[PDB]
Write a protein that binds this ligand. Structure first.
Ligand SMILES: O=C(/C=C/c1ccc(O)cc1)O[C@H](Cc1ccc(O)cc1)C(=O)O
Length: 407
């Protein structure tokens, strides 16, 4: 019940010199065809001209005068050609209050499908969706190429794109586009054995069912430790709950994958624009997860995160430097599946700070993903001090997963 209205490609207003620049080694840790995408929801207010299209286009140009690589040898890079940034405005016969709590069920008309079979550099790298409803509310669906930038950089871009629409100046440190700070050493000397690069522990006794279910949970009972970060304890609990709810045989290896922003532990320049996301991979058998205390799992995840010191991160970069190709090491879409698990945390991220001049977001959230195996941590826009756990799991296991509440 959604249909396209307009499809535009936006140039910057200024020149923005478009010399192609170098992608990092961590940027090459994704498939050549992948968009990470989420949606921003805005409810209508008493103000006239709620998200006018022309104002947003002439604000998008004033935003692209800084972030020009969004419009644009044997190694991946797409030149800043300044030819266009896809912006498709749609129309829906819907009421935003009928959504209720925004379960991201796969009715993907809030975003478009892209085709890079015609060319990997033919179409641009990011797409925005401005879909307007019957109630006057609007959904803004963002879809970004992971090679170009991570969630932090695209979030900073959307915050600049917010401040330059509300008549305010640029948000913080202006974006830095030279990724030479994430370059390998000279010479490259790895010093550790990296399990973030070894293949995931698949090949278990096969699964009878394949259909999955998504569930988004509220947990207002964070304020208890039954003897570490909040994230480490919570991730240990989620991981133990999943490994118990799956009923896998003891001796089956499970592997938790955790994104980790390497801007702080390393010395990255401010406004660094690109992927600075490493991986924290603690491995353990499902038995010793289910047959030991929560202390075991939380210590395992804490050792998985605390290993990522400066030496280990630079050694990982040098290990990537030693490789033939790096995109052959990028696991995904099959690493996601059981017995493996992802857990992220958007609680610390400023995902609600984008205010275009019409108010804050009622709800932003992920949409349309390779679903199973990925647990997310979100903040509640009700700001009751509560926290959301958005997980996807096979149906046989989602009902078992209710022991997350059992401390
Ligand atoms: O969760 C985020 C969200 C990104 C985002 C934030 C705000 C926006 O407006 C738009 C996108 O990023 C991760 C990326 C990722 C995945 C696996 C890894 O091993 C390393 C990194 C993801 O989407 O899964």
């Amino acid at each position: 019940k959604i249909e396209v209205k307009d499809s535009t490609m936006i140039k910057p207003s200024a020149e923005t010199p478009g010399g192609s620049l170098w992608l990092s080694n961590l940027d090459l840790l994704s498939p050549a065809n992948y968009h990470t995408l989420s949606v921003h929801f805005y409810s209508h207010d008493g103000s006239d001209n709620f998200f006018d299209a022309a104002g947003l286009k002439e604000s998008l140009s004033r935003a692209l005068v800084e972030f020009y690589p969004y419009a644009g040898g044997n190694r991946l890079e797409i030149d800043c050609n300044n030819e266009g940034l896809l912006l498709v405005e749609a129309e829906c016969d819907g009421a935003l209050d009928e959504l209720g709590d925004f379960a991201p069920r796969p009715e993907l008309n809030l975003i478009p499908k892209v085709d890079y079979s015609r060319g990997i550099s033919t179409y641009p790298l990011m797409v925005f969706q401005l879909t307007r409803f019957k109630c006057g509310g609007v959904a803004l669906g963002v879809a970004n190429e992971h090679h170009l930038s991570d969630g932090v950089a695209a979030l900073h871009f959307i915050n600049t794109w917010a401040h330059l629409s509300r008549g305010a100046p640029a948000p913080t440190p202006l974006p830095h586009f030279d990724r030479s700070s994430l370059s390998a050493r000279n010479p490259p000397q790895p010093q550790f054995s990296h399990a973030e690069y070894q293949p995931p522990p698949t090949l278990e006794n096969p699964l009878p069912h394949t259909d999955i279910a998504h569930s988004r949970f509220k947990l207002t009972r964070d304020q208890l430790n039954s003897l570490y970060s909040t994230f480490e304890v919570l991730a240990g609990h989620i991981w133990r709950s999943v490994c118990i709810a799956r009923g896998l045989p003891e001796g089956q290896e499970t592997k938790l994958h955790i994104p980790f922003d390497g801007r702080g532990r390393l010395q990255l320049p401010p406004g660094f624009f690109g992927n600075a996301i490493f991986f924290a991979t603690p491995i353990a058998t499902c038995g010793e997860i289910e047959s030991n205390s929560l202390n075991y799992a939380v210590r395992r995840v804490s050792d998985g995160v605390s290993r990522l010191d400066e030496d280990y991160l630079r050694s990982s970069i040098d290990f990537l430097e030693l490789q033939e190709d790096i995109s052959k090491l990028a696991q995904g879409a099959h690493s996601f599946r059981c017995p493996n698990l992802w857990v992220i945390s958007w609680v610390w991220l400023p995902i609600y700070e984008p205010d275009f001049g019409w108010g804050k977001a009622v709800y932003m959230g992920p949409w349309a993903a390779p679903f199973e195996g990925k647990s997310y941590l979100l903040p509640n826009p009700e700001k009751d001090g509560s926290l959301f756990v958005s997980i996807t799991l096979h149906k046989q296991h989602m009902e078992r997963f209710e022991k997350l509440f059992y401390e």
